[PDB]
Amino acid sequence: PASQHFLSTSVQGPWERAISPNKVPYYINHETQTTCWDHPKMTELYQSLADLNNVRFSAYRTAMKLRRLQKALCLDLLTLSAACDALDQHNLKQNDQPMDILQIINCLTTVYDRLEQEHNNLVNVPLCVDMCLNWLLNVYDTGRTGRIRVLSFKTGIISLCKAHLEDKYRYLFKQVASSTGFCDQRRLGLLLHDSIQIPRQLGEVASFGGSNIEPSVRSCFQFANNKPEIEAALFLDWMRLEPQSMVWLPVLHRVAAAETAKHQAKCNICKECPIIGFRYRSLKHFNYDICQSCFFSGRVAKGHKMHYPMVEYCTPTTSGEDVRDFAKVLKNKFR
Amino acid sequence: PLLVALLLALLLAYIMCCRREGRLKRDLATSDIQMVHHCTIHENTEELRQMAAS
């Protein structure tokens, strides 16, 4: 294409942009044998992302960027039921079934037709199909072979859809467990590998233990009391234990919920009242409430302490609960 | 009533002495790079409405 020479200079060094038979451009990381795509709309999206390197912590960064992507991709308009019906309509039930470009295109069309019928003024089917194919083959097509697995695509869509966190957990467990509902080390490892293929695409894989899924499986099966197989309830409990390699999805759910939160409080640095979004309350001092705008920059008022405990309200508070925790912090400061 | 008036004066002392509080001095201690963050974290926060529009 004529845009190859024009936009090959948008990135430099080892990155090597190449075109695909489906006329979608993609970069090449040749010695890692890993490849990623970059559409011009996703190019400007990533350029906007690159200015948002101000997040101090890891999980917050991943959740905020993934929320920005999901809202930009308009895949937050997709529910669990529509995606499940679309995947069951194309008979993509075997997790190890090879998937060509055409089957993914058909399933994406099935999803996005319903999405546009619900969001005529918000969803454009061909552009959204191109964007979602771009992202999915970014995550799970690093080899440029045109073949992916049904399980990885299912995991990506279910994680990036609009549904309850435990509902997505249960569906993914059913996808990876057998007909008896049992999951051994290998299926859990495959699911964790598919999950860890996501942060490496953006560049925050090492902060959560790297790409080594073995410690995660070891922790999960140690919580399983060394059981040969794990169950859905034990999987949910271990997930609520907030492991290192999976906390990003509940952090995403929280930030999505708190995006519409409005707290009647004042920021104890930038004096912003009312607090909109995330409210953070210190568990040591009194009358100290900070907004996430100053929290993410790392600026601290009155300095930190030997220990500086913090609670993170993501929803408008209940007066009973905050009076209880105020009584707790008075009790703590009394001692 | 003298004790009562003394307590009322004690109330008025911090009622008027506080005079709200400043924010520019906290900006002064804030690094200008952190102030650059303050714009960006507010830019996407104020873009929440344009998240719904888009």
């Binding site: 912003e272 009242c273 | 009533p1 009562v4 009322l8 008025l12 009622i15 924010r23 303050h38």
Partner: peptide
């Protein structure tokens, strides 16, 4: 990029009024 608005002088004048009425009525009692 600093925009916060809460009526503060109205709060001080309200506290002033509450204070003076407290003084006056306790004196009356």
């Amino acid at each position: 990029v600093y925009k916060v608005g809460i009526y503060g002088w109205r709060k001080r004048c309200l506290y002033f009024f509450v204070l003076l009425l407290m003084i006056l009525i306790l004196v009356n009692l």
